[PDB]
């Protein structure tokens, strides 16, 4: 009886194994665009993915993730609200059973069909496992997906998903360029928060881009053919793997723009 997304082990139950679920800096949150404050001291984000080295794609039983070689300073995120350098470790998505839900963050209560998270860890902490013990250990870049035109840079990901249908499957996934997943603008909101899955650690500086990317109905329908179950177990489609918005509490969301 591990955690997951269902009636019996979903977000409303996680607090019993992970009491920080009721903490003061939980994610995701609703971004109220009217109350987010423009902060002229923020910088433009620096997204430097030119040397990114993807290695593998994995169905974790909760989502799928594309992992990178983060044993050297290749693909990094800096600037914006961040102090120092954050190295890209992996990206993953959360998505819905229907095009009207699936994102973790919301914008003026709007839900998007999915949300991409690019997870980076602060190199001052030496590796990821140390970084997630720190209040400024991770920086997660969040990008909304809406359904419309296909995203060409997503198709390599979509087409390998049939090889990782079930929990614990991986496949080689080299030479994938995550720049193809980024919208035109790097305008963003930022706030201090948490992992959105157990253990829900409060170690994340969230940077959520305002501009969603467009993906096609067929691309997101291929996400929904993944399975939460292992091979040889009853089929449970991997859909609705998002945590709802959590209370903002004593936090301010800052805007990098207008
Ligand atoms: N959705 S999210 O981006 O907040 C997220 C992470 F990025 C994340 F890294 C973890 S983790 O548990 O440390 C394992 C993944 O690297 C998470 F638990 C987690 F929830
Ligand atoms: Na190395
Ligand atoms: Zn995530």
Token readout for 122 is 């602060």
| Angle value at C-alpha 118, between 70 and 220, nearest 5 degrees | 130
Number of H helices, E strands in the chain: 3, 15
For every residue of 100-133, DSSP letters joined together read: T---SSEETTBPPSEEEEEEEEEGGGSSHHHHTT
Cα separation of 137 and 177, whole Å? 24
Contact 95/102 with Cβ under 8 angstroms? yes
| d(C-alpha 18, C-alpha 200), whole Å | 7
Query: Atom 7 of ligand 1 has which residue's CA nearest to it?
Result: 119
Element (H, E) at 48: strand 45-48
State the burial class of residue 212 (Cβ atoms within 10 Å of its Cβ: 0-12, 13-18, 19+).
buried
R_g (Cα) of the chain, nearest Å: 17
Inter-CA distances, 131 with 64, 125, 210, Å: 22, 5, 26
Mutate to test the pocket of ligand 1, among 17, 104, 197, 206 (most ligand atoms within 8 A of CB): 197
Confirm if 49 and 42 have CB atoms less than 8 A apart. no
Sign of CA dihedral 170, 75, 181, 63: positive
Tokens of 48: 């430097």
In the chain, the number of structural domains is 1
Place of tokens 């614990």: 168
66 in contact with ligand 1, CB cutoff 6 A: no
Structural domain that includes position 61: 1-258
**Helices of type H across 27-154:** 128-131
Q: Is 132 in the pocket of ligand 1 (CB under 6 A)?
A: yes
Task: Report the alpha-carbon distance of residue 110 to residue 256 in Å, rounded.
Answer: 20
Q: How many CA atoms lie within 13 A of 125 on its CB side?
A: 20
Question: Around Cβ 240, how many Cβ atoms within 10 Å?
Answer: 16
Q: How was this structure determined?
A: X-ray
**Ligand 1 neighbour 25 (Cβ under 6 A):** no
């Amino acid at each position: 009886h591990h955690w997951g997304y269902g009636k019996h082990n979903g977000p409303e139950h996680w607090h019993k194994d992970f009491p920080i679920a009721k903490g003061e800096r939980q994610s995701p949150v609703d971004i109220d665009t009217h109350t987010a404050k423009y902060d002229p001291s923020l910088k433009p984000l620096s997204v430097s993915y030119d040397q990114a080295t993807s290695l593998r794609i994995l169905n974790t039983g909760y989502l799928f993730q594309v992992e990178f070689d983060d044993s050297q300073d290749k693909a990094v995120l800096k600037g914006g609200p961040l102090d120092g350098t954050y190295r890209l470790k992996q990206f993953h998505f959360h998505w819905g059973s229907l095009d009207g839900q699936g994102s973790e963050h919301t914008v003026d209560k709007k839900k998007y069909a999915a949300e991409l998270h690019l997870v980076h860890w602060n190199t001052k902490y030496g590796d990821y496992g140390k970084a997630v013990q720190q209040p400024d250990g991770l920086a997660v870049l969040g990008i909304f997906l809406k359904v419309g035109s296909a995203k060409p840079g997503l198709q390599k990901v979509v087409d390998v998903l049939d090889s990782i249908k079930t929990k614990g499957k991986s496949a080689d996934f080299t030479n994938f360029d995550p720049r193809g997943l980024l919208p035109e603008s790097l305008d963003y909101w930022t706030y201090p928060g948490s992992l959105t899955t157990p253990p829900l650690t409060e170690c994340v500086t969230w940077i959520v881009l305002k501009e969603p990317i467009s993906v096609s109905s067929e691309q997101v329908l291929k996400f929904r053919k993944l399975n939460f179950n292992g091979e040889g177990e009853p089929e449970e489609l991997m859909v609705d793997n998002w945590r709802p918005a959590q209370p903002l509490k004593n936090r301010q969301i800052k805007a990098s723009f207008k």
